[PDB]
Ligand binder design. Sequence first.
Ligand code: HEM
Ligand SMILES: CC1(C)[C@@H]2CC[C@@]1(C)C(=O)C2
Ligand SMILES: [K+]
Length: 405
Amino acid sequence: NLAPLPPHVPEHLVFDFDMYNPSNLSAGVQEAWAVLQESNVPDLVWTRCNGGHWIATRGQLIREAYEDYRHFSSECPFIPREAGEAYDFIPTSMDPPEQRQFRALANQVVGMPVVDKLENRIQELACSLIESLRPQGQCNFTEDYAEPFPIRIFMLLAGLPEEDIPHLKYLTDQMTRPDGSMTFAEAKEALYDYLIPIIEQRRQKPGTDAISIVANGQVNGRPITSDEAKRMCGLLLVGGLDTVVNFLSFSMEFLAKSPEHRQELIERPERIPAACEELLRRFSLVADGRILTSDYEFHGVQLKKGDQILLPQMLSGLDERENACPMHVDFSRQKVSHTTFGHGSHLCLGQHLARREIIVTLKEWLTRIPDFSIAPGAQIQHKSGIVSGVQALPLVWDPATTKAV
Ligand code: HEM
Ligand SMILES: CC1(C)[C@@H]2CC[C@@]1(C)C(=O)C2
Ligand SMILES: [K+]
């Protein structure tokens, strides 16, 4: 379904890329998005898919747009427009100056000071989950580790029951990779339906969990409102349930398919942090955007106020202009350039927790299960959206080659 071409968009810039179901998805989602960087494609194109929107295809433009919030507003950050308009999470739906005050509060619940504190719980859960899987010689990685590890850590931090995960995970997924049964607005309202009573309960009787902290927090000297707290907690839930969860699967899929890279990290464990960064570049997975605040000429293209522009965070690091041999995974890559965690004033606030979860996973998995592979005859299928992922990741290994710590 292609939307009618707006009067100001020239046909030579039309490239009908569908961010929710890209044409070359079978080759891997990053590969599918990379088609936007083929020689015949302009730096900035217009797709008639998903209501019609621009797409910046090179790191230079992506970075410039994320820095220029005066022209590229985060008030409507998602495609399609209905989703971008319903999207009201804090701080993401706000532009500076208003946005700034809320970042400090979010940092208090998912920032570094919180990670170093959860250190032991994170370490222990990773080891427990992996040791239980180790003797089985197989696992469905997405449901057996990728989901439970980061999600249970988030539910613990947020003080929410693990039995609520199926419902919350479903809702979160409808906001990033909708199956069609719910509009973004309906999923958002359902998430708020869940959160409102909890936020009120915790404003009445404060706990030490993340929701209590946000709900009773202050923003630049004054009390946060119940509405603001809800809009912030909603965002934290999405971040905890649909980011690292997907990234871990892209990384494990790659390691399962590349014995040489596994051996490198097994023989030189000190390279894991660097490997984490290279994997974050190669398997970057987020793509949201902004809305034009006024008519603006950007890199020779006339943009109109109201136009939506997708600025794929995923593409910067895959841009050959930023990293040579972009599809290659080089743990010794000198300068790892990427915008995987964003760029500009909205730089990811959960990246410290994310890196910890990634590094702990790499270390603890390779320590116990150094040799593993994709299950016999399995064809790994990816899924695309605001956050891309892996549909299923069946892995196998010989228990005799494992180590119980
Ligand atoms: C692999 C893991 C992750 C990736 C790739 C990632 C990526 C991003 C990106 C690209 C943005 C910028 C969005 C924009 O500019 O519209 C962002 C913002 C944010 N992220 Fe993450 N993220 C990850 C994990 C997390 C986690 C685990 C949390 C906490 C639960 C988190 C919390 C946030 C928050 C609160 C913001 C909003 C910052 C603002 O709008 O000021 N993220 N993230
Ligand atoms: C684009 C993001 C990855 C970032 C954290 C969760 C997410 C889906 C948002 O809505 C802001
Ligand atoms: K909005």
